[PDB]
Amino acid sequence: KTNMKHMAGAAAAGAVVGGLGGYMLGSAMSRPIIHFGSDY
Amino acid sequence: KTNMKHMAGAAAAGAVVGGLGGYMLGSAMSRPIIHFGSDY
Amino acid sequence: KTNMKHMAGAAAAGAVVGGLGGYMLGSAMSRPIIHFGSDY
Amino acid sequence: KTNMKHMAGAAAAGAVVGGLGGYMLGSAMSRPIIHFGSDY
Amino acid sequence: KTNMKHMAGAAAAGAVVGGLGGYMLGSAMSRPIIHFGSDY
Amino acid sequence: KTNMKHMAGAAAAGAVVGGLGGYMLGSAMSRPIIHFGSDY
Amino acid sequence: KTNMKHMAGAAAAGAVVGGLGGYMLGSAMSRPIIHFGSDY
Amino acid sequence: KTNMKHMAGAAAAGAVVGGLGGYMLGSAMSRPIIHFGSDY
Amino acid sequence: KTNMKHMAGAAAAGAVVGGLGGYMLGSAMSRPIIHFGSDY
Amino acid sequence: KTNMKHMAGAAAAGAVVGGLGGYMLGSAMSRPIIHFGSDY
């Protein structure tokens, strides 16, 4: 029995926020997640 | 028995928020997720 | 018995929000997800 | 017995929101999902 | 017995929202999903 | 003057090749492209 | 003057090739393209 | 004058090649590209 | 004059190659590229 | 004059190669690239 499981080459997560004009009284929220496969 | 399971080449998640004009009294929310396959 | 399961080449999820004019008193919400196949 | 199951080449999900004129007192909501095939 | 099941080349889902004129007091909601075939 | 040009929500291109039976002395070639609109 | 041009929600291009029986001495070629509108 | 040009939410390109049976004396070539809009 | 140009949320490119059966005397070549918009 | 150009949230490129059966006398080549927009 041979097993190869739960792999990925490259994974990247991020966010870019830019304040250049206007007022921006609110918010700029970002929550990007990456989850692989869990074994049971 | 040979097994190859739950793989992906490249996975990327993110968001770009740009404030250049207007007021932006509200919000800019982003939640992108990536989940692979879980074993049971 | 040979098995090859739950794979994908490349997967990407994200959102771009741009404030350039108007007021934007509301919101700009985005939740894009990607889920692979789970084993039972 | 040979098995090849639940694969896809490339999968991408996202949204683009642009505020350039008007007021936008409301919302711009987007929830695009992609789910592969689950095994039972 | 040989099996090849639940595959697709490329799958993409998203939405583009543009505020350029008018008031937009309402909403712009989009929920596009893509689901493959599940095994039982 | 206000301008919004050359946008798309999500774009994905790929190919899946599976060798499970037969001989496959030939080839399996795939070249899928996606090009947006160019400005002049 | 207000302008909104050359947009699409989601665009995907791909191909699936499966070798399961026979000989396949020939080829399986696929070239699907997607081009948006160009400005002049 | 306000300008918003050449954007996309998420873009992904890839290929999955699987050798499980047969001989595969040939090839499995894939070249998927994605190009945005160029300014002149 | 305000300018917002050549953006994307998330971009991912990759390939998965799996040798599980058969001989694979040939090749498994993949070259997926992603190019944004160039300014002139 | 305000300028925001050539941005992306997250970008990832990679490849996964798995040798589990067969002979693999050939090759498994992958060259995925990602290029942003160049200014002139």
Task: Give the pair of three-digit tokens for residue H34.
Answer: 């994605």
F29/E contact by beta carbon, under 8 A? no
Resolution expressed in Å: 3.5
Strands (E), chain A: 2-19, 29-30, 33-35
Inter-chain Cβ pairs, chain D and chain I, closer than 8 A: 7
Residue of H nearest to G18 (CA): H18
Three-state DSSP string of G1-40: CEEEEEEEEEEEEEEEEEECCCCCCCCCEECCEEECCCCC
Nearest to H4 by CA among C19, E35, E36, C27: C19
Q: Do G2 and E10 touch (CB under 8 A)?
A: no
| Among candidates I22, I32, I37 on the partner chain, residue whose Cβ is nearest the Cβ of F19 | I22
**A28/A32 Cα distance (integer angstroms):** 13
Q: How many residues does chain G have?
A: 40
Q: Give J24's contacts in chain H (Cβ within 8 Å).
A: 19
Inter-chain Cβ pairs, chain B and chain I, closer than 8 A: 33
Chain Cα centroid distance, residue G29: 13
Q: Give C28's contacts in chain B (Cβ within 8 Å).
A: 26-29
Nearest to C7 by CA among D36, F12, B1: D36
Instruction: Evaluate the CA torsion angle I30, H34, C34, A16 in order and state its sign.
Output: positive
Substitution target from C2, C34, C39 for chain A, most A beta carbons within 10 A: C39
Structure solved via: cryo-EM
Instruction: Give chain I as a DSSP string.
Output: -EEEEEEEEEEEEEEEEEE-SS---S--EE--EEE-PPP-
Residue of D nearest to B10 (CA): D10
**E14/D36 Cα distance (integer angstroms):** 17
Contact yes or no for F12/H11 (Cβ under 8 A): yes
Contact yes or no for I5/I37 (Cβ under 8 A): yes
**C14/H2 Cα distance (integer angstroms):** 24
Bridge partners for A32 per DSSP? none
**C2/C13 Cα distance (integer angstroms):** 32
- Which amino acid appears at position J9 of this protein? G
Nearest to J26 by CA among I31, I24, F17: I24
The domain ranges of chain A are 1-40
Residue of H nearest to G37 (CA): H37
What separation in angstroms does the CA of D25 have from each of C28, D19, E17, E31, H15?
11, 11, 14, 21, 43
Residues whose CB falls within 8 Å of the CB of residue F6, separated by 6 or more in sequence, listed in order = F36, F37, F38, F39, G5, G6, G7, G36, G39, H5, H6, H7, H36, H37, I37
Nearest to J13 by CA among J38, J39, J35, J37: J35
Bridge partners for E10 per DSSP? D10
Contact yes or no for H16/H32 (Cβ under 8 A): no
Bridge partners for B33 per DSSP? A33, C33
Chains C and E touch (3+ CB pairs under 8 A): yes
Nearest to C29 by CA among J5, E39, J2, D26: D26
Q: Do F20 and D4 touch (CB under 8 A)?
A: yes
- Which amino acid appears at position E21 of this protein? G
Q: Give F10's contacts in chain H (Cβ within 8 Å).
A: 8-11
